Scaffold this active site. Sequence first.
Site, short mmCIF file in Angstrom:
data_model
loop_
_atom_site.label_atom_id
_atom_site.label_comp_id
_atom_site.label_asym_id
_atom_site.label_seq_id
_atom_site.Cartn_x
_atom_site.Cartn_y
_atom_site.Cartn_z
N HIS A 1 -1.27 -4.88 5.53
CA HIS A 1 -0.67 -4.04 4.41
C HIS A 1 -1.79 -3.24 3.71
O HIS A 1 -1.40 -2.12 3.35
CB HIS A 1 -0.13 -5.16 3.42
CG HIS A 1 0.46 -4.72 2.14
ND1 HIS A 1 1.79 -4.82 2.07
CD2 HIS A 1 0.21 -4.05 0.88
CE1 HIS A 1 2.08 -4.22 0.76
NE2 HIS A 1 0.86 -4.04 0.13
N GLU A 2 -3.04 -3.99 3.48
CA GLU A 2 -3.86 -2.89 2.67
C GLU A 2 -4.43 -1.82 3.51
O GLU A 2 -4.71 -0.70 3.03
CB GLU A 2 -5.32 -3.97 2.02
CG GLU A 2 -4.68 -5.17 1.62
CD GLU A 2 -3.87 -4.79 0.15
OE1 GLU A 2 -3.85 -3.94 -0.16
OE2 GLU A 2 -3.19 -5.81 -0.18
N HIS B 1 -2.28 1.02 3.32
CA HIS B 1 -1.96 1.92 2.36
C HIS B 1 -3.17 3.25 2.61
O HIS B 1 -2.80 4.36 2.17
CB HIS B 1 -2.74 1.29 0.97
CG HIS B 1 -1.56 0.45 0.27
ND1 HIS B 1 -0.36 1.07 -0.17
CD2 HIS B 1 -1.49 -0.81 -0.16
CE1 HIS B 1 0.37 0.10 -0.81
NE2 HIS B 1 -0.03 -1.08 -0.94
N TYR C 1 2.19 6.69 -6.01
CA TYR C 1 2.36 5.29 -6.34
C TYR C 1 3.01 5.03 -7.74
O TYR C 1 2.60 3.98 -8.60
CB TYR C 1 1.01 4.67 -6.19
CG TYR C 1 0.84 3.05 -5.81
CD1 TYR C 1 1.57 2.73 -4.69
CD2 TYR C 1 0.71 2.16 -6.88
CE1 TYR C 1 1.50 1.13 -4.31
CE2 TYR C 1 0.64 0.54 -6.47
CZ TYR C 1 1.02 0.20 -5.13
OH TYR C 1 0.99 -1.13 -4.86
N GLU D 1 4.80 1.02 -0.91
CA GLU D 1 4.86 -0.31 -0.64
C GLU D 1 5.50 -0.91 0.74
O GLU D 1 5.07 -1.83 1.23
CB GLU D 1 5.28 -1.14 -1.86
CG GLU D 1 4.49 -1.24 -2.98
CD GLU D 1 3.22 -2.08 -2.42
OE1 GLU D 1 3.59 -3.14 -1.86
OE2 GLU D 1 2.23 -1.81 -2.40
N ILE E 1 2.98 -25.25 -2.15
CA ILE E 1 4.47 -25.13 -1.85
C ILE E 1 4.75 -24.61 -0.53
O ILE E 1 4.18 -23.41 -0.22
CB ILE E 1 5.05 -24.19 -2.85
CG1 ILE E 1 4.66 -24.48 -4.44
CG2 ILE E 1 6.59 -23.99 -2.68
CD1 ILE E 1 5.00 -23.62 -5.32
N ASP F 1 5.10 -2.39 -13.35
CA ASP F 1 4.79 -2.37 -12.05
C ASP F 1 4.71 -1.06 -11.44
O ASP F 1 5.28 -0.91 -10.33
CB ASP F 1 5.60 -3.49 -11.07
CG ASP F 1 5.32 -3.63 -9.58
OD1 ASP F 1 4.13 -3.42 -9.36
OD2 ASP F 1 6.20 -3.85 -8.89
N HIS G 1 6.52 -2.74 -6.26
CA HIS G 1 6.61 -4.16 -5.56
C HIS G 1 8.20 -4.85 -5.54
O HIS G 1 8.12 -6.00 -4.99
CB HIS G 1 5.53 -5.20 -5.72
CG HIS G 1 4.26 -4.74 -5.76
ND1 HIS G 1 3.39 -3.99 -6.91
CD2 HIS G 1 3.42 -4.55 -4.63
CE1 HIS G 1 2.23 -3.53 -6.25
NE2 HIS G 1 2.16 -4.16 -4.83
#
Length: 316
Positions: free
Chosen positions: A142-143, A146, A157, A166, A197, A226, A231
Amino acid sequence: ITGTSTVGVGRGVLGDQKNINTTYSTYYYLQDNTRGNGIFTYDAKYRTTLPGSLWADADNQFFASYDAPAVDAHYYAGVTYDYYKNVHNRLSYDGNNAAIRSSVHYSQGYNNAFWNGSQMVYGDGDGQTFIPLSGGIDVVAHELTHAVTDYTAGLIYQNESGAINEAISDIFGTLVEFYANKNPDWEIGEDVYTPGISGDSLRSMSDPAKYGDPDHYSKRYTGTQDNGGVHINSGIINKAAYLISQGGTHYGVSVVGIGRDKLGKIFYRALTQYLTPTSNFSQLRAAAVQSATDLYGSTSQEVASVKQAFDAVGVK
Ligand SMILES: CC[C@@H](C)CNC(=O)[C@H](CC(C)C)NP(=O)(O)CNC(=O)OCc1ccccc1
Ligand SMILES: [Ca+2]
Ligand SMILES: [Ca+2]
Ligand SMILES: [Ca+2]
Ligand SMILES: [Ca+2]
Ligand SMILES: [Zn+2]
């Protein structure tokens, strides 16, 4: 640094052993010379100055707890490089083998990761919301995606262009996770999110609503948080991409799936040949339709499925 290419061994954030490409000159550095003009991993030492120090190790063995985020940032950057090169014929994020730089141990308790315009940056998490974020291959990809976006479409963005930005990072993060083929899924960040979790994730592409994100344009967020919901509204595009690949019937609209590889070809072409900094969701639909037309023909199932998927999420 100048030195000789070596192969170290270590353990990642989830406890798994892997080999890493290093460089020897007095110390063994996290510098992989086997890919482009190098992959370089740095220690930010719990501070916010970047990049920090090129990661140095005395013995080429990386089994300490402090080493694990560096091992995974370095190794998964290599996997992501390999995906772009082998699958899309793209040499690093700029298409000309730019050096790939990442810093780990950024700040204290830092529940995020980002591309800062020049490099990747990973927090360690606070141990509750996240463990060190480079432990997720989908996160690393993902990074780095970008950076690909910034060098290609340049999607601004914020608002719809930012939600496309995104979603492109979630889509290719997921396709890289499938490429590596270790516990792949259509969820984002599951390997590093909420260690206490089981079974959750940061976002879901298959069912964005599970985590409060929209799965239809009529449910888009239009407030200012955001960066205008980048996101959040990504869920609409993530859902469309999931449907293109896997098929399904969504709000009564049936989509014939065409599989992951064709999804990736369509979206890579849209990203690199048609999208612009200001593209909105309707313009993404048009770019994906044109891309599928180029690759498969106007009368193809692939084009029909792209149209069905955007119809299903309310994007005309
Ligand atoms: C809790 C984390 C959730 C709520 C949001 N983060 C994310 O989805 C992913 C990480 C996930 C995959 C684990 N990080 P990102 O989208 O690359 C963070 N973007 C970023 O900082 O943009 C701002 C910026 C802009 C310009 C320079 C510098 C910085
Ligand atoms: Ca060592
Ligand atoms: Ca997974
Ligand atoms: Ca995943
Ligand atoms: Ca969890
Ligand atoms: Zn992102």
